[PDB]
Amino acid sequence: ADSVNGAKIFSANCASCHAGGKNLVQAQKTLKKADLEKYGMYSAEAIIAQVTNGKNACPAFKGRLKPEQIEDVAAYVLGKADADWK
Ligand code: HEC
């Protein structure tokens, strides 16, 4: 996984709803470490599955992003959650 490529994917695909690690559509479901842990989403496998397939109003990216790009953005988010958002 390549977090730097991940940041690029995040800017292009995720910041519309998750700028600042927030969630503009479902406010408590943020990208902060504490929230990812709380909801069982603090792992690459968990983020990949949800980004790929979607969940409620979290859009699915299967076929819109390549599998490796989904992997990269999951690594970014975990890194960011660890360093800056929490
Ligand atoms: C709005 C149009 C969104 C875009 C663009 C992306 N996400 Fe999202 N995300 C969105 C919602 C409404 C929710 C909550 C869904 C629910 O009902 O539970 C989510 C949730 C996530 C989560 C889970 C966060 C948590 O605290 O549990 C993750 C990890 C996540 N979203 C990641 C993510 C990525 C990497 C994105 C771009 C590729 C992305 N999301 C786009 C809404 C939207």
For ligand 1, is residue 80 a contact (CB within 6 Å)? no
Method by which the coordinates were obtained? X-ray
Q: Is the Cβ–Cβ distance between 29 and 39 less than 8 Å?
A: yes
Determine the topology of domain 1-86 in CATH: Cytochrome Bc1 Complex; Chain D, domain 2 (1.10.760)
Helices (H) and strands (E) counted in the chain, each on its own, are 5, 0
Q: For ligand 1, is residue 16 a contact (CB within 6 Å)? A: yes
User: Token pair of 16, please?
Assistant: 């519309």
Tell me how far apart the alpha carbons of residues 39 and 9 are, in angstroms, rounded to a whole number: 23
Ligand 1 neighbour 30 (Cβ under 6 A): yes
Give how far Cα 59 sits from Cα of 13, 33, 47, Å: 10, 21, 13
Q: What separation in Å is there between the alpha carbon of 55 and the centre of ligand 1?
A: 8
Q: Which two tokens stand for residue 78?
A: 């975990």
Q: How far apart are the first and last CA of the chain?
A: 22
Question: Can you tell me the distance from the alpha carbon of 80 to that of 26, in angstroms, rounded to the nearest whole number?
Answer: 20
Q: Which amino acid appears at position 54 of this protein?
A: G
Atom number, ligand 1, closest to the C-alpha of residue 9? 38
